[PDB]
Amino acid sequence: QVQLQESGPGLVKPSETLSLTCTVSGDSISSSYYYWGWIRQSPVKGLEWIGSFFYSGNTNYNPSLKSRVTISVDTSKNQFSLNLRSVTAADTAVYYCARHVTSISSWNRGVYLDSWGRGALVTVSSASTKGPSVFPLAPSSGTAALGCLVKDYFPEPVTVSWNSGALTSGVHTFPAVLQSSGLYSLSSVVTVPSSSLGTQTYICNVNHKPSNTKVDKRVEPK
């Protein structure tokens, strides 16, 4: 029914202010039965409600963050925003914007979260952004495996596609691993018919938006 999309920096230095914006498509920000708020998720704390902005203009923040949180709306641009001040590593998480729907008219209780953004990962760290190096995983001489090694980037995430998205069947893009260097690394592999090696071209497209890195890498049998 409605589509939400977070935007904002993926890397914030400790003690500075994290800022995210949700853009809403498909209906207006203003309403008399739904409103807007934010959720975050991390591996050890799980899901955590941050706060909301009622359609009457009233804000409601989680007491564990309340001193540091501000939520605002922009009905002209159909957006609403999150500011989280004086962040630390404890604020690294995936941040979701979510539509709050009242089940009883004018009532703050019984609300449910209709639609969520895709999630914006924010890493709080003093380290600098680094784009990845992309190396081929060459297929070996019925079914062959090839891939791309996406190595030494910061911060998360990278996205990998194959042949500009025309190849999806048999693709496995592994979860990134944090190396002892503090940099991330992952592999994306795909299984293909051995007959297609030599007739079919295989390109992996790696995108790392924190560093503005876009790399296309052609993967050949040797």
């Binding site: 899901l47 019984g110 953004g117 190396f135 496995h172 592994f174 990134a176 691993v177």
Partner: protein, 214 residues
């Protein structure tokens, strides 16, 4: 304020089986209890709101019951695409709080992994590092053992692995194991071998290459 506890914390069941998830609230929350499903890499999606109302577009095998402190989410016939973590959330008192989640895993027949090994590329070697990657593709169950041997000397501490989440269509896992050496250390040995042990394999499977050969 109000704490939510789910049970079980994790379960593994076959396709077509009934799944029962229980959520308990630390105080009475009437029917103000929502259920969410989160699949890998995706945001949570609303399944059931106010304890029992099915969200538009959610298949009818999902249903919710309960009031007061005890709530239940039921899946009448588990499907491969239903692999997810399921969350309850009380909406009675601010701040809204979520349960810790129940991870639902699909139990399928055993499937042995297909093993591939990849040498480092010359582009990476010239930059001074060697990454050797071992791929285990499309296996079940998730438990697997990968051992690196370099000129028959077992390696330790110089590899990291990564496992995909369960595939939404065939319910298998894939795993990568990456061995990392400096170029100097890489050029000191010839045979690089990845040795895989898995319930689907009658005996361990080894894939290897000789450095500098093709």
């Amino acid at each position: 304020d109000i704490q939510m506890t789910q049970s079980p914390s994790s379960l593994s069941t076959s396709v077509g089986d009934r799944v029962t998830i229980t959520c308990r609230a630390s105080q009475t929350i009437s029917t103000y209890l929502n259920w969410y499903q989160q699949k890998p890499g995706k945001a949570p999606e609303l399944l059931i709101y106010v304890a029992s109302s099915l969200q538009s577009g959610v298949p009818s095998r999902f249903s919710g019951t309960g009031s007061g402190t005890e709530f239940t989410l039921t899946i009448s016939s588990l499907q491969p695409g239903d692999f997810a973590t399921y969350y309850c959330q009380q909406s009675y008192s601010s701040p809204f709080t979520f349960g810790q989640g129940t991870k639902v895993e699909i139990k399928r027949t055993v499937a042995a992994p297909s093993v591939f090994i990849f040498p480092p590329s010359d582009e990476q070697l010239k930059s001074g590092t060697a990454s050797v990657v071992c791929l285990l593709n499309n296996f079940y169950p998730r438990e697997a053992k990968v051992q690196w041997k370099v000129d028959n000397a077992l390696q330790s501490g110089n590899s990291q692995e990564s496992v995909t989440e369960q595939d939404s269509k065939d319910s298998t896992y894939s795993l990568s194991s990456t061995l990392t050496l400096s170029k100097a250390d890489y050029e000191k040995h010839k045979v690089y071998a990845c040795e895989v042990t898995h319930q689907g394999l009658s005996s361990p499977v080894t894939k290897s290459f000789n450095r500098g050969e093709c």
